[PDB]
Each structure stands twice: as C-alpha cells, then as structure tokens.
Amino acid sequence: QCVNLTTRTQLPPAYTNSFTRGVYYPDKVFRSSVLHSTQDLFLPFFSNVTWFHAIHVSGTNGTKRFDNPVLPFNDGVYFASTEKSNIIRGWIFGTTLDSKTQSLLIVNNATNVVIKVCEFQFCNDPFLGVYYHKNNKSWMESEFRVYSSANNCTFEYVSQPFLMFKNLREFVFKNIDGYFKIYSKHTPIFSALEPLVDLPIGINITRFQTLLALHRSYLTPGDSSSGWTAGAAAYYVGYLQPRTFLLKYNENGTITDAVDCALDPLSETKCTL
C-alpha cells in the first residue's frame, strides 16, 4: 500500500506562456457561419501558465526525484502534457482528499478509463503501481497505492481510453451544476477543443492532484533505492477565468478563430463591432 515518497521541497516555480491554446466549444449546439459572443470560463490569451516537472532526473550525477503536487482547481483547470510514455494516467479531484468527504478518481489504462466518485482514503503520496504477474507473464496495475480504503461509491463510469512521435494532450476541466465537464484535443507532434464527457457527479471540486504510474523497481540486494521509478514526466497547468470571448464558427460549424475581448484595445474594438 501507501509509499512514503517525499523529497524536501518544490523549490523552483516554473512558468511559461499560453499563447492562444485554451478555446473550448462552450456549447454543443451546432452553429454555421456565425460570430457568437459568450461570457464563460476560458483560459485567458497570453496567460502565464506553470510548467510542472513531476519526474525530473538528475543526470549522470544522481537518480531521479519526485515532486508531484496537489494543486487548487479554483474555478477551472487547463491541463496539458506532451508525452511518449504512459506515465500520466489521470487525476484525482476532490476537497479533503481523505475519507471525510467524497472525491473523484480518473484513471486511464490501456484497455479502459475508470471514473469513480467515492470516499477514498488517499495515501499521502499517490500513484498507480505497475507490477509483474508471473503467472500471466504481463505487468498489471494496482490501484491500492492510490487509495487504501474505498467507501460510499455513488459513481462508476468505465469506457474507452483517452490519454492511453510525441503526442500533445490538451484538457479543460470544469465542475459546474454538479456536472464534471471535460474537453479534450490530442495533437501528434488553430485548433478546436472538442468536448469529451459531462459526468453528473454532483460533488465539490476545490483541489486536485495528477495521477502518475510508477513501475516497480526490482532492486538487487544492496540498493537503498525507492523501488518505484518510471521514466520522466512533466505537465502544464493553467486556471480558467471568467472572460467574454468572440468565437467565429465555420460554415461546417468549426471554430476557426476566437478573440479574447479584454486582452488589448484592438481586440475590444473587434469585439464591440
């Protein structure tokens, strides 16, 4: 069960810029050749977003170290991560992140997504452990590193995977009306963010933490190593804010262009006319 995988501190706050990325179809209603203006929780243009290094290696000098933080969800979250290796499996969203309240668990595996809203006693350092089943001759995944006790399940949703050269994955999370609304676009490496699912979970979402997968390290006799290491991983988190946007829909319905009206006086002039 729970592994006590703490490093001294998240010392550097890493930042970057969200040039034009967080534009999500705010409604599912098809419109054609139109200029629809909406006030909604968008990612502001040229916002300063944060680069998180979750698994960040120490060169020839040292082995890797682990800094996966619990983060606020505030009013919304733009998530982004371009990764070759299935290290980022999902997220946990919730309030207390212990039993006292319920919380949301989103874990994506090679066959399926599992989405759960249930009272989880989350381990203080959370991950999904992948181990070798000698009989099967395949590696298999254990969820009990994430949660040690499961109680009071109201929601279970199992479906086809989303997160599964480098393939940028972009996500927008909202929790409004008791409805966890998820928007997603994958990009192999201007682009519409197209809705994934609206889950009726009906819970308070105030904070979240990324879910990471750590292969078991079958150590030789003398190592003092953790026993849980898997590749390297990094991700980008930004926060949605209330904004009026002018979205331009195609003849085919596609959002070809959008403008943040509060960014600069020119964008306001395009907005008013």
Partner: antibody, heavy 121, light 110 residues
C-alpha cells in the same frame, strides 16, 4: 529488500514426509520466482527445484522425481516444499531462495536462514 | 549438485589476488551469461557476490569480480582480507535446470 523466513527445524524418521514453509516480505510472491536448495553437513549446495519464469511451470530436479512437491499460496505469501520417502541422506539444511522473474537472470539474490531436517531412527 | 567442476581449495596470502574457476560445458556456462557466484561462511546461509557474469550487487566490495571464457567462468578476489575466508559456489542455468557446482574454500593464509 525481500526477506525470506522459513519454518522451524524438524526431526523425522525413515519413510516419513516433511513440509517446509517460507514466508516472503518486502515484495509479494507473484513478482519473484521461488527455488529450493539443500546443503548436507559439510557438503555443497544442491538445487531441488524452482519456478521457470518464461515457461510458467515449476521445475523439479532429476534427483527428487515424484518425491518432492513444491506449492505456493499467493494470499499468505508463503512457499511450500513437501518431501516424501525420507531417508538419512536427506538430513540437510533446506534453504528457500529467490530470483526475479521479469529479468530471468537465474541469480538467487536472497536466501532464507535455512531449515534443518534431521532424519534418523 | 556437482554439475559444474570447481577446485577444492584456493590458497592466498592477505592482500594478494585469488582466482576460483568454474568449468562447465557449452550448454550451461558456455551457452548463457546467466552465471552467478555465492559466498558462504560456515554455519551461515549463502550470500550473492557476482550476478550476470561480471556484474556485482551493491555492498559487495570492488575487489570481487568475475568473468567467463568459453566453457569456463572464474571469480577473482583481489585485496584479500580475512572476511573472504569462506566456501565459494558458482551457479548457472542449463536450459532446463539450474545447477550449483561443488565448492571451493579460500584460505586466507595466516
């Protein structure tokens, strides 16, 4: 690290049957293959049998055919080894050892303290 | 049991280097690189010293190193210190079986 703790020593008479346990800690039984060897007084190590990682099938050495039987219980994390038709030659210390299954590098990294089976009428 | 051939004793003055050889066939030591080496102090359970032919587990000092040539492997113990007086057992996969071989007693000569 993995830690292997065996059953206490036992005394038997010729013709009897003996069963030795082996409790594994630190890593669960389904992640590491189990092999049993024995050492007679002063003599060398002799492989009794083990588990083939690539071909999932316990392997028994030619010496102990239809006479040894090795079983594992994954829930209790305990490995078992039953030897029937005991005779004075079987008087030895019996070690349970372990090698990783993924790599299959046939290196018995970790050993039990040993179980002394003493056969004498 | 006795599948691999390995000498009865190994003499060495302290500080010197000793080499214990483990001789097999093309089907056990000559066919694979799955050779291993084990120390054993008297009345005490064995201990791994060399894994995968040349590799060494941590905590084992630098002075132990092994290799193989043709059908014969060998363990070499330099910087002889009295902690090394023990029996030394080699081991290797035979394709269907894993068989330890004989013994050898380093005798730190005093």
């Amino acid at each position: 690290q993995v830690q292997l703790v065996q059953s206490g020593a036992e005394v038997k008479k010729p013709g009897a049957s003996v069963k030795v346990s082996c409790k594994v800690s630190g890593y669960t039984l389904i992640e590491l293959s189990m092999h049993w060897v024995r050492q007679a007084p002063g003599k060398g190590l002799e492989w009794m049998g083990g588990f083939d990682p690539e071909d999932v099938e316990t392997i028994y050495a030619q010496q102990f055919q239809g006479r040894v039987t090795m079983t594992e219980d994954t829930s209790t994390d305990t490995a078992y080894m039953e030897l029937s038709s005991l005779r004075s030659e079987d008087t030895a210390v019996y070690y349970c050892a372990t090698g990783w299954a993924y790599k299959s590098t046939w290196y018995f990294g970790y050993w039990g303290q040993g179980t002394l089976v003493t056969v004498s009428s | 049991q006795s599948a691999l051939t390995q000498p009865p004793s190994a003499s060495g003055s302290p500080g010197q280097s000793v080499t214990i050889s483990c001789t097999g066939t093309s089907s056990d030591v000559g066919g694979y690189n799955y050779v291993s080496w084990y120390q054993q102090h008297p009345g005490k359970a064995p201990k791994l010293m060399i894994y995968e032919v040349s590799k060494r587990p941590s905590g084992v000092p630098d002075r132990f190193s092994g290799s193989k040539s043709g059908n014969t492997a060998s363990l070499t113990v330099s910087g002889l210190q009295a902690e090394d007086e023990a029996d030394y057992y080699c081991s290797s996969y035979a394709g269907s079986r894993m068989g330890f071989g004989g013994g050898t007693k380093l005798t730190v000569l005093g």
